[PDB]
Amino acid sequence: GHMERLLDELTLEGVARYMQSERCRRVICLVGAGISTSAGIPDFRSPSTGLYDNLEKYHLPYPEAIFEISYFKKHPEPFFALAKELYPGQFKPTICHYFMRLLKDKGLLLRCYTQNIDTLERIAGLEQEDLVEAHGTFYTSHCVSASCRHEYPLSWMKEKIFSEVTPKCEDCQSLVKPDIVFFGESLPARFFSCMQSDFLKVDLLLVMGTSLQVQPFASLISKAPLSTPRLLINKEKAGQSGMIMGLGGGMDFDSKKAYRDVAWLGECDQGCLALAELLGWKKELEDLVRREHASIDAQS
Amino acid sequence: GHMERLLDELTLEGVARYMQSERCRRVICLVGAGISTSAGIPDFRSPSTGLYDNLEKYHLPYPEAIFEISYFKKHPEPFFALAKELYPGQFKPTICHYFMRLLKDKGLLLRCYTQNIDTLERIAGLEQEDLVEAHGTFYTSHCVSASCRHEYPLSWMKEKIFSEVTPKCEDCQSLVKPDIVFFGESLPARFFSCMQSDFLKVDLLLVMGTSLQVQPFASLISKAPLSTPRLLINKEKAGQSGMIMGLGGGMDFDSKKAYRDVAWLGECDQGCLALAELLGWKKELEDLVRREHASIDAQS
Ligand SMILES: Cc1cc(C)nc(SCC(=O)Nc2ncc(Cc3cccc(OCc4cn(Cc5ccccc5)nn4)c3)s2)n1
Ligand SMILES: Cc1cc(C)nc(SCC(=O)Nc2ncc(Cc3cccc(OCc4cn(Cc5ccccc5)nn4)c3)s2)n1
Ligand SMILES: [Zn+2]
Ligand SMILES: [Zn+2]
Numbered sequence: 001g002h003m004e005r006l007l008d009e010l011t012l013e014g015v016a017r018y019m020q021s022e023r024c025r026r027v028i029c030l031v032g033a034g035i036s037t038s039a040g041i042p043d044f045r046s047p048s049t050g051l052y053d054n055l056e057k058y059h060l061p062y063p064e065a066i067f068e069i070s071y072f073k074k075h076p077e078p079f080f081a082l083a084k085e086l087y088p089g090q091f092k093p094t095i096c097h098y099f100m101r102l103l104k105d106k107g108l109l110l111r112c113y114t115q116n117i118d119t120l121e122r123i124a125g126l127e128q129e130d131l132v133e134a135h136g137t138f139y140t141s142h143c144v145s146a147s148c149r150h151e152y153p154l155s156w157m158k159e160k161i162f163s164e165v166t167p168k169c170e171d172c173q174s175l176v177k178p179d180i181v182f183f184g185e186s187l188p189a190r191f192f193s194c195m196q197s198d199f200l201k202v203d204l205l206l207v208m209g210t211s212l213q214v215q216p217f218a219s220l221i222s223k224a225p226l227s228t229p230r231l232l233i234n235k236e237k238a239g240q241s242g243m244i245m246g247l248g249g250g251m252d253f254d255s256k257k258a259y260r261d262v263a264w265l266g267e268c269d270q271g272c273l274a275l276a277e278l279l280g281w282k283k284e285l286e287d288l289v290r291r292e293h294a295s296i297d298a299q300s
Numbered sequence: 301g302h303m304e305r306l307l308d309e310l311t312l313e314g315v316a317r318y319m320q321s322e323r324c325r326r327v328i329c330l331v332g333a334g335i336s337t338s339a340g341i342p343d344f345r346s347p348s349t350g351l352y353d354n355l356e357k358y359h360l361p362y363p364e365a366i367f368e369i370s371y372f373k374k375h376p377e378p379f380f381a382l383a384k385e386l387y388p389g390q391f392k393p394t395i396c397h398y399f400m401r402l403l404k405d406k407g408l409l410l411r412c413y414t415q416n417i418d419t420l421e422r423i424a425g426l427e428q429e430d431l432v433e434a435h436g437t438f439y440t441s442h443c444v445s446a447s448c449r450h451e452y453p454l455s456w457m458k459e460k461i462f463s464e465v466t467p468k469c470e471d472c473q474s475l476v477k478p479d480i481v482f483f484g485e486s487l488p489a490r491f492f493s494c495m496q497s498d499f500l501k502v503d504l505l506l507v508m509g510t511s512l513q514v515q516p517f518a519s520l521i522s523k524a525p526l527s528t529p530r531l532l533i534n535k536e537k538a539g540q541s542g543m544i545m546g547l548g549g550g551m552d553f554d555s556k557k558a559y560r561d562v563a564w565l566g567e568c569d570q571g572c573l574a575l576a577e578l579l580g581w582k583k584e585l586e587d588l589v590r591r592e593h594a595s596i597d598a599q600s
Contacts, residue, residue, distance in 0.1 A: 003362045047542050062303045064526055064545055183526060186496040196486040214548030219519040226364055226483060242347050245364055248514030
């Protein structure tokens, strides 16, 4: 026999009918750089953006040094010069971000796991307890001295970045680092406690704008229950992997045993708008996006 | 420029010279089913063993149910019948197991992470603090009742398995389950605390007898520092993956930018014997294996 098939069809339409059923109570979103590209934030981890060409001016010992905590702590100037160069010109969350805001407000969002450091999930109205920032965030920064750990808001860090003043702690004069996770740093215990709890409870996994190549994200889709449907909204297929019954396995969109995974291929905004339309949420979403973007524009 | 290359050559000979240098102080072993196949324990997660054919007699609702905690707790009889059928006829650790014992005794072993549930690492002389059992172990079993959690040794569980008596707790009559991790169960917090600490400290990763397909193992090789050499001893290449500078990346044995990863293709015993020989440990290892196997044979 076969385990229950919660999707009636392996399509967006099937996912939408499942989302409207009684069974679909707790949704986890896994989101990456693809949900912020339409907001004008390039994927720094992509080869196509050409960050290798970006780094030559700083004269690093090797190009990977920009991501490493040991190098940062001794020579922070390249990081902060790069951060100025890459600082987004505006912070308008995308349709995809506001789709997650609707999930929150409808009580469907168990958690949003994000690979992004841009804070747009928070600007869109997701709160701290809704979020697991898998690579940290620019939202807060801390003094790197263990005895101090003075916390600084993004407004403080922004001024330092734009004025090209290396941020130093006002209490102890140590370096102040954004709460993004450099190579050589550990994730908080919260990441793993959330992850172990959340993935026992998930009724639907929405994977949006991520190739699922980079850890810790690349481990997450296999933690869902075996019958929990998984929808990918992304430009290309991702997360596909010889194991018994495809267990300990990635996505199976296309084999003859495929029973729960769906790939919708295109831009995340377009995918989320199509999904919202199926759910009867298109007007709510478009109205939400309009008023929120307007509120941001009203403060310029 | 390029980060330091701790291996002078991408060969076993290069790894051995590195192991003998001052820099190589802390070794992590990541081991899987391939280190116990020569001891007569097949890889149950492999398609080649044909566990699908093994399960038909038990009349499960679906074949994946044998691995799921919810099904076990309601219908434990298939699991225990299967466990009898798969119970190893002997427990002689392999040359590979005893290679890790040498690393322990020489003070080089930071940790052994194992995918195996067979207890052979413990029989070989690795202690609890040396080990992270990524899929748990048969070594201990527990009453499944949260209010009780009575612990039972393997000798107790073995008698129950062979006599075909479903193990019940002597205090409360709930089911007693081996400490192997079923689908729907969480890993201990120790796994993640060890993992975050260990992988900041690792000077050499020895990956032996694992395809690195199944989580949580599939996330571990990317947590090592970027300059830490990684040796694979396995029948075929594994852990190979478009990301900037191959970051957030699997093994790079074969590209033109390969700088730290080595694949030795063959049986784990043969690989470990060859590595030991390079290190001047062949006699020590062969003597260790002989006396330990003899000690086991002396108790038959
Ligand atoms: C509010 C605000 C301010 C600013 C300045 N930007 C942004 S969004 C735009 C952006 O790309 N900005 C960047 N500013 C510095 C960057 C370099 C860097 C250095 C160290 C760790 C780090 O991010 C955390 C990490 C590290 N890794 C590891 C790994 C894996 C695979 C490939 C590359 C890196 N992934 N995520 C990043 S990228 N948002
Ligand atoms: C001391 C002793 C006693 C006995 C009886 N055997 C052994 S070694 C031989 C052997 O294969 N025995 C087995 N006895 C029952 C088995 C079935 C089963 C049921 C549930 C979880 C579990 O192991 C833990 C897990 C679960 N997963 C998940 C996943 C991922 C990918 C493919 C298949 C399973 N990986 N490891 C395993 S396999 N050693
Ligand atoms: Zn301070
Ligand atoms: Zn009990």
